[PDB]
Amino acid sequence: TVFRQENVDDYYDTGEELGSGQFAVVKKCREKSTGLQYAAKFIKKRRTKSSRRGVSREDIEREVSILKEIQHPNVITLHEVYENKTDVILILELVAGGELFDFLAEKSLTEEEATEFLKQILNGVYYLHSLQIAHFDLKPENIMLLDRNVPKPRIKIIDFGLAHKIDFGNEFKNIFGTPEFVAPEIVNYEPLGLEADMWSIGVITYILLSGASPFLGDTKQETLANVSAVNYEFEDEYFSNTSALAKDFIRRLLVKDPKKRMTIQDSLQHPWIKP
Numbered sequence: 001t002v003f004r005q006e007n008v009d010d011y012y013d014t015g016e017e018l019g020s021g022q023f024a025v026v027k028k029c030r031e032k033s034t035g036l037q038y039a040a041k042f043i044k045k046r047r048t049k050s051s052r053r054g055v056s057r058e059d060i061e062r063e064v065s066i067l068k069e070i071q072h073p074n075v076i077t078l079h080e081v082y083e084n085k086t087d088v089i090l091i092l093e094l095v096a097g098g099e100l101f102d103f104l105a106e107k108s109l110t111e112e113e114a115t116e117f118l119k120q121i122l123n124g125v126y127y128l129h130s131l132q133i134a135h136f137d138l139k140p141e142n143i144m145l146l147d148r149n150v151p152k153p154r155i156k157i158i159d160f161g162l163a164h165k166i167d168f169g170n171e172f173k174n175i176f177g178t179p180e181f182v183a184p185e186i187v188n189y190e191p192l193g194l195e196a197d198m199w200s201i202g203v204i205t206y207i208l209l210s211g212a213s214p215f216l217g218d219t220k221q222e223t224l225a226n227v228s229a230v231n232y233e234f235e236d237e238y239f240s241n242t243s244a245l246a247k248d249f250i251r252r253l254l255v256k257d258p259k260k261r262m263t264i265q266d267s268l269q270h271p272w273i274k275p
C-alpha cells in the first residue's frame with residue numbers, strides 16, 4: 001500500500017520535538033491549509049531486504065492499517081500518511097500534556113488518582129480488544145495526557161508500533177518490548193494474544209500505586225528472568241496504606257498462565273473498578 005509522496009514540508013511546518021526512538025522521531029507540526037496541529041511520526045525505512053536498521057515495510061503497513069481502524073477517546077486518531085525514499089511520516093493526533101511517565105515523577109498516586117487514569121486505560125484497551133487488536137507495548141511512555149494542569153487528566157494511548165490483529169486468538173511473533181512491562185509469554189517467545197496487554201496493565205497499576213517497578217532488576221536479563229518467574233511482591237514500605245482490593249486487582253493480572261489472567265472484561269467487573 002502506497003502513501004502520499006508529495007513533500008510533507010509543502011503541507012506542514014514542524015516545531016518542537018515530542019519524542020525520539022531507535023527508528024522514529026515525533027515532531028509537533030501544523031497543517032498549512034487549516035492551522036490545525038498534529039504530531040508527525042517519522043519512521044526510518046529499511047534500505048535493503050536483509051538489513052536490521054529501519055522498519056520493514058510490512059511492519060509499517062501493519063501499524064498504519066491498525067491506526068486507520070481505530071477511533072476512540074482514549075486512543076490517538078491518524079490524520080494522514082506521507083512517504084519518501086527515507087521515511088514514512090504518520091500525521092497523528094497531537095497529545096501535548098506529557099507522558100504518564102513524567103507526570104508521576106512530579107508526585108505515588110492515591111487510589112482515586114490511579115483508578116481515574118487506570119479506568120481510561122481500561123476503556124481504551126477494552127475498545128482495542130473488542131476489535132481483536134493487541135497493543136503489545138503498554139507502558140507509561142505510551143500513555144500521554146491531553147492536559148496535565150487539570151485535577152483528573154484525560155489520557156490517550158499514543159503509539160501502535162507493535163500492535164497486531166489477533167484473528168486466530170494468538171500470534172506467533174517476537175515482541176521486543178520493554179522488559180519491565182512484557183508478559184512471561186513474550187519473555188519465553190510463546191504464542192501471544194490479548195492476555196499480554198492485561199499483564200502490562202497489572203505492571204502499570206503496581207507502579208501507579210507505589211512508584212516502584214515490580215520486576216525491575218539491575219540488568220535486562222534479571223528483569224526478564226523476574227518476569228518469567230513472577231518474582232514480585234508488595235513491599236509494605238510502599239503499599240502499607242494501599243487497599244487489599246487494589247492488591248487483589250494486581251494479583252489477578254500478574255499471573256503467568258495467560259488463560260488464568262483476568263481479561264479486559266474481567267478487569268472492568270473487578271470490585272476495585274466496578275461502580
Ligand SMILES: O=C(/C=C/c1ccc(O)c(Cl)c1)c1ccc(O)cc1O
Binds near residue numbers: 020023038039092158
Ligand atoms: O516519542 C514517541 C511518541 C510520541 C508522541 C507524543 C505525542 C503524540 O501526540 C504522539 Cl501521536 C506521539 C515515540 C513513538 C514511537 C517510537 O518508536 C519512538 C518514540 O520515541
